[PDB]
UniProtKB/TrEMBL annotation, chains A, C, E:
Its main location: host cell. One of its GO terms (cellular component) is T=1 icosahedral viral capsid. It is found in: Host nucleus; Virion. The gene is V1. Keywords: Capsid protein, DNA-binding, Host nucleus, Metal-binding, T=1 icosahedral capsid protein, Viral penetration into host nucleus, Virion, Virus entry into host cell, Zinc, Zinc-finger. Belongs to the geminiviridae capsid protein family. GO terms for molecular function: DNA binding; structural molecule activity; zinc ion binding. The chain holds residues 40 to 257 of 257 of the full protein. This is Capsid protein. Binds the genomic viral ssDNA and shuttles it into and out of the cell nucleus. It comes from the Viruses. It comes from Ageratum yellow vein virus. One of its GO terms (biological process) is viral penetration into host nucleus.
UniProtKB/TrEMBL annotation, chain B:
One of its GO terms (biological process) is symbiont entry into host cell. Belongs to the geminiviridae capsid protein family. The keyword Ubl conjugation does not apply. It is found in: Host nucleus; Virion. One of its GO terms (molecular function) is structural molecule activity. This is Capsid protein. The keyword Methyltransferase does not apply. Keywords: Capsid protein, DNA-binding, Host nucleus, Metal-binding, T=1 icosahedral capsid protein, Viral penetration into host nucleus, Virion, Virus entry into host cell, Zinc, Zinc-finger. It comes from the Viruses. One of its GO terms (cellular component) is host cell. Binds the genomic viral ssDNA and shuttles it into and out of the cell nucleus. It comes from Ageratum yellow vein virus. The lineage of its organism: Viruses, Monodnaviria, Shotokuvirae, Cressdnaviricota, Repensiviricetes. Its main location: host cell.
DNA sequence: CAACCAC
DNA sequence: CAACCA
DNA sequence: CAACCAC
DNA sequence: CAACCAC
DNA sequence: CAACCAC
DNA sequence: CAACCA
DNA sequence: CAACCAC
DNA sequence: CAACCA
DNA sequence: CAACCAC
């Protein structure tokens, strides 16, 4: 019944039920089924830092597709593992991976890059807050850490990241669809990752999942 | 008066109109895990090489091209065969399932491949065909030609929606599954997969 | 009933009835309703001669549109008037307009032009047959004349052309649709007009109508 | 049914383009003139069958003549010589007639057996100062299975003929004023197998 | 419909349809759906030879289960690959793998073993026929070969075995079910494999599939 | 049974003995190039029927190329275009294909009505340093009964064709290195009676 | 067909 | 009969 | 039908 | 059959 | 035959 | 045709 | 089918 | 509770 | 929630 109605739907549009009615699940303005979108990747983290846009969703009929240019992201579910490489783990040290889920109210360009948005002493991600000028544009919705420790004879090779986070965030795109950061006219959810230890890196195998609904507004 | 339309020979039953072609020209990078592509992918529209309704009958598939080895791989002495399977998925959904999770087999070996015991009602193998290629330092068989015409009366039903996507197919979707017999090194397959179809008289 | 079924038809295709069944009106192979196409124009005729393609039909869903690249023209209905201009009609002379409805089995280019296909002595349209070499390519399906006579005090200012002609002719286009002579892959119906008198011209207000059906073949 | 009896090969065409200047005395031209050779539109042997003649074109009045009020029909006679010899014989000395009048033209008594009139047809043109019929269109196709023969030599001439030979004789009905005739005469023939 | 009837069947017995009726597919005596049974394995072949029983099927309600002690094997489908190991393939030689699908009308013990049934000169599998005395007991239903060639610079590493073979063979078990060669009271299908080259071995990754029906007789 | 319909006379031959140096790009040659004339091997009229083609010879690798460890098939396509204009088109602009690969080659979508592939045959050559297959023997007889037409002109050229015209397209399957093809293409034809 | 003449 | 429509 | 060309 | 040649 | 196009 | 499934 | 054995 | 599915 | 910024 769940699956049938979506396949047997009228050509270009959602099933009638969705159009009609509203679950308590869906936020204000927006309608339709809770569409998912996933970013599965092994991110190689550094001291300088890494970025990715997690609102990157293309436009289309089906599921995992925005319909219009506007849509509301209701929640983000980051899950996976951060870990040390087999040659690095021998060396005795510790590193926390700093995750910052930020929003930029006025986005453009390809990517902002870490340390060109976060102000910090000696390029240190633990002392990181938004820059004086960009403070208006960028806001940190969530931040969360994850520790990993190397050692010759005894090591903590890996750490499991599992973090659900609800953030009712409305985003607006261009007319053209590419599922790219460049296309976002309104705010776009960015995940910024940074390794606390200066020299050696850490890996982060992550599924970043994002849950969203299509906007009726405008 | 109204005479019934004498449907010409060499069009399928319940189908009429001109035979429409659809091509999927590509260099496929074949592996041991196995590659897939849907060959019933055709969009809905008034243009040529589009379907009109949701129903149409593929009458024949024509696979032609070449399997070949890279310049660094061809020096290494081995043999490997590409195993083509043209399978029908009767009741499809979602993304097209990978070669590993449709066919069951010992040690992910495509030569021992048959359809999984569980989902045997769903998938059927219409045609299978091999193609062997041999590496060698001084004397290699670098490449192998593929030329394979196969007549299959396959009636696909589509989603209401217009799109040339696999998710749309309601039933009898056509998948071409490919897999290399040798585990380590890969093989290239430059292929034109052509498909010859007729639109259904119904709807 | 006639009109309703065509408007209420399924989206991209003809009404079911046409698909099913075949009238005695429609030729072999082809199906569907008898689609018309009109070329209404005032042609200014000369001694050198004028050309137009009358199989120029674009591609589309509706009526006056070919569906596929192939279609069968069943009949041509040329109707209208040839006439003399108010300053020319004073002068005493006679001119017949020579109409040639020809078919070129292997067409290309923009237009062949008159006297580059018809061989004739002293550029004279009355002595006109197809050239020695092009004889294989071009065939004259119909030819027909129409006389007009000038005079100071007594004139025959105008003459009424009315000519229906059935010619079951199959034509094939490119994939692209422009309703242009250039697009015809197979034979295209050309109308060639020429004034018999050398010096002064004559006008020809013509509706050239063409009746055709869409091909099931190939 | 296409190719005639005793002859074979493709239907070869032969054309004659000319502005014939017509008179009351009468003009002649041999339409069976075709040369011998391996090329196209040539005869191969000395014998061939002319299946059909296609005369098409215009008969017209000159600009200084058309002002003068009169009428003239041009009489076209397509005739067969069964015994050609020397040069082509003139209109006046083949046909007999009252006072050189082409409308009364029939073949002379003595050589009535030699020449036969296969087809005759008229074409009228009328002058006039303020209103005129300057021109008229000729378009006569006629089928006449005519087997002709030539000498051992070749030049597409009336002198080289023997047995049958097709002459077109043209004559203007009005005495004083001349008229022009732009004519494509097109003969369709097949090479003989017999003899 | 196919799948539903088998799951919704009455407790201990086959669907009613099977009980009632008989397809042309099923052999004489026996009834019911065509039950499969698979033996997927990497067999390590030698000059001395290897054996396996391919009628090894246990007893039970479901599919891939015999119901009674008797059943008819209709066909065997051997498919897979024979191949040379990465260190062996360097050496220049050739070996054919000899497959013998034999039947022993009066089976007992754990396994008969190769060369204790096949008579051959100098333990050579190519010269192999059934022994003088056992000739009555054992019969070779099919034999088939497969060649593989080693070489330093140019090798034929592997060869694809694909062999369907229809052999309407009735077999009878003990009351107890173990899917073992020991349990066969009547004839049991045995596959005997042997490498033709004396010294080095070859591998054989094989799915041996067997298709059978349950007996109504006795 | 020997002479085709609408045709006459002796079965005239025409040969194209040549060493064709083949590439990945694709070579072409028109096999119905026959001159007009009274002589033997010439056509007489503008029309004739090619009954059968007999391709025979050898594809082979050069002495410096054969040492290099590789393989290539030579793809022969005997195509016919219903409409010939100007010079003969190159292999790439008739057949559409991925990466200019002749093993994927079918006729372009537009000119599919125009060009038809009558016969398609291959031949492999495998070069290696210490062991090789330098050459392969091509032998292929094939009946077709292709009626072709020409201009009034008399020259064995693709430009002079009208209606059907037999083109042999040849393409090496390997990208970089070339191969030779010593070939006798022998066309068997009869002169046409029709038209 | 043209008009006593012939195919 | 007129010209794809009854 | 138009005129050796083709459907 | 091998290829317009013949038996 | 080759592969929706033709003879 | 592939291999008990349509 | 494989090879005097059997179904 | 797990993570848009019951 | 994260940290003067915004929803």
């Amino acid at each position: 019944n769940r699956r049938r109605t979506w396949t047997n739907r009228p050509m270009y549009r959602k099933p009638r039920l969705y159009r009609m009615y509203r679950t308590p699940d869906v936020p204000k303005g927006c309608e339709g089924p809770c569409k998912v979108q996933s970013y599965e990747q092994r991110h190689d983290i550094s001291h300088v830092g890494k970025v990715l846009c997690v609102s990157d969703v293309t436009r289309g009929n089906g599921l995992t597709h925005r319909v219009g240019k506007r849509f509301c992201v209701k929640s983000v579910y980051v899950l996976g593992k951060i870990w040390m490489d087999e040659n690095i783990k021998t060396k005795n040290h510790t590193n926390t991976v700093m995750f910052y889920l930020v929003r930029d109210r006025r986005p453009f360009g390809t990517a902002m890059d870490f340390g060109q948005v976060f102000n910090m002493y000696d390029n240190e991600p633990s002392t990181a807050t938004i820059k004086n000028d960009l403070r208006d544009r960028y806001q940190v919705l969530r931040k969360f850490t994850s520790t990993v420790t190397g050692g010759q004879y005894a090591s903590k090779e890996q750490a499991l990241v599992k973090k659900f986070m609800k953030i009712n965030n409305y985003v607006v795109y261009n007319h053209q669809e590419a599922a790219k950061y460049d296309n976002h006219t309104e705010n776009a959810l960015l995940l910024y990752m940074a390794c606390t230890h200066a020299s050696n890196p850490v890996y982060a195998t992550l599924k970043i999942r994002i849950y969203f609904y299509d906007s009726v507004q405008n």
